[PDB]
Design a protein around this ligand. Structure first.
Ligand SMILES: Cc1nnc(N2CCN(c3ncnc4sc(CC(F)(F)F)cc34)CC2)s1
Length: 466
């Protein structure tokens, strides 16, 4: 059901031929999501899943891609009868969106590993009857576009996906599952999650994609991994080129995660003449500030990871403190476990390892060490302050004694003469959380009072009886 003009670039014989196809589609009124996702899934399958026979690039013949496209469009058009769902006002109804979501859901294998790699694309849907969670949401949007439903668009948070549709694109509907063991809410709005101020729904500051941002999503979705130790260089090059295409056309402007993904790719293999990874992480943060009220966690996490890998301890601490400054205005809710896991690993594994190495290097005579810099101690304190403020008013707690052991260790890496230089005002720091306010006294003693720290961080009421 492809148009003549969509077929003229075939066969695709290289990475650059795939980029030309994307450029041509992006120059259209509506880029064809189904065509583009089938092409990426086909090339990913033959570059990462099965490389038998590979000599340069997996040639994508029109006959092959057109037959896959026909399989998809026949499946959707046959199973969704539009006459049963009249379109009032050129916009779609909740019943129609639910029907398309059910069609995709009911097509999937009964049982499979939902966390596998390479199950994101429409190629996986057609050839393997398998999709991952956000892959189902994308497939609903592709199916709606195939049906002529121009109002149905992908909605993305940092850990979940759903659709928007209807009058002014103001309706929301769940179309896929989230996480593992959670009961699905397909067909419902996301209002209760927005109202409860969970990270999962970003207080309503989630992405409402247009079609070009949906192209950017499938490009972010490319998975170059061949196995635990090995990435496809061909898929890395393709993903990086397509991200630059999108960047140049303006379609990453409102997509912080895509800018961090591009910066990560540039760190691995920089493109001559292009912005540095740092510039790109900063544009990701600027995008979040401009379009999403600075309510996103990952723009700062991407920046912190880059500084961590480069052992810029000062700047890694600052960027994690900034992540905590975002999280402090959320309530920690059921289904936010992924961001809890990330903050736990930063506090209880990554920061301790960085400071352990810093301590060894200070023993060896380093100058300008983070451990002698009171501004770095302040960043450490601000990171814990935001985590404590996050916990306030949340329906489930965050901190426990496991966190306290690492806090004491991390504090102890800074000498008392460095800790004393931070000014805690009601380097200068203001605490927002009642936990860190009560800890202020303790933060300056030559020997940290471990037991009193533990009591203040966990709000534990009592010590051992005997
Ligand atoms: C620091 C970080 N390093 N990698 C990070 N990733 C990997 C890239 N990710 C993403 N990159 C582009 N777009 C999206 S939309 C989305 C939510 C989902 F999966 F649709 F439900 C995730 C995500 C998720 C966050 S954060």
């Amino acid at each position: 059901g492809l148009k003549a003009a969509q077929k003229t670039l075939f066969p695709l014989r290289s990475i650059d031929d795939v980029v030309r196809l994307f450029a041509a589609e992006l120059g259209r009124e509506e880029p064809d999501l189904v065509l583009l996702s089938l092409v990426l899934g086909f090339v990913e399958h033959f570059l990462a899943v099965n490389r038998v026979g590979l000599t340069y690039f997996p040639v994508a013949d029109l006959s092959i891609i057109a037959a896959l496209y026909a399989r998809f469009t026949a499946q959707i058009r046959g199973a969704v009868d539009l006459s049963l769902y009249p379109r009032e006002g050129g916009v779609s109804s909740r019943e129609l969106v639910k029907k398309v979501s059910d069609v995709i859901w009911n097509s999937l294998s009964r049982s499979y590993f939902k966390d596998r790699a390479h199950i994101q694309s429409l190629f996986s849907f057609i050839t393997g009857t398998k999709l991952d969670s956000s892959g189902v949401a994308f497939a609903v949007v592709g199916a709606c576009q195939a049906l002529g439903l121009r109002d149905v668009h992908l909605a993305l948070s940092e850990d979940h996906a759903w659709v928007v549709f209807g009058p002014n694109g103001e309706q929301t509907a769940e179309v896929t599952w989230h996480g593992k063991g959670n009961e699905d809410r397909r067909g419902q709005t996301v209002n209760a999650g927005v109202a409860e101020r969970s990270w999962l729904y970003l207080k309503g500051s989630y992405m409402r994609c247009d079609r070009k941002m949906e192209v950017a999503f499938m490009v972010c979705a490319i998975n170059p991994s061949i196995d635990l130790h090995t990435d496809s260089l061909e898929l890395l090059q393709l993903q990086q080129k397509l991200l630059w295409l999108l960047y140049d056309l303006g379609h990453l402007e409102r997509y912080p995660m895509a800018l961090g993904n591009l910066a990560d790719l540039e760190e691995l293999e920089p493109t001559p003449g292009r912005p540095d990874p740092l510039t790109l992480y900063h544009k990701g943060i600027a995008s979040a500030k401009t379009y999403y009220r600075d309510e996103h966690i990952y723009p700062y996490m991407y920046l912190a990871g880059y500084h961590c890998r480069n052992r810029n301890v000062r700047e890694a601490l600052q960027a994690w403190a900034d992540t905590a400054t975002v999280i402090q205005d959320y309530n920690y809710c059921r289904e936010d476990e992924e961001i809890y896991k990330e903050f736990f690993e930063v506090a209880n594994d990554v920061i301790p390892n960085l400071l352990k190495e810093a301590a060894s290097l200070l023993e060896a005579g380093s100058q300008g060490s983070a451990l002698q810099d009171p501004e770095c101690f302040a960043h450490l304190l601000r990171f814990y302050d935001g985590i404590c403020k996050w916990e306030e008013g949340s329906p489930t707690p965050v901190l426990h004694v496991g966190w306290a052991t690492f806090l004491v260790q991390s504090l102890g890496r800074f000498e008392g003469q460095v800790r004393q230089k931070v000014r805690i005002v009601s380097p200068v720091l203001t605490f927002q959380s009642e936990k860190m306010k009560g800890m202020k006294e303790l933060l300056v003693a030559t020997k940290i009072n471990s037991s009193a720290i533990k009591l203040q961080l966990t709000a534990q009421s009592q010590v051992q009886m005997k």
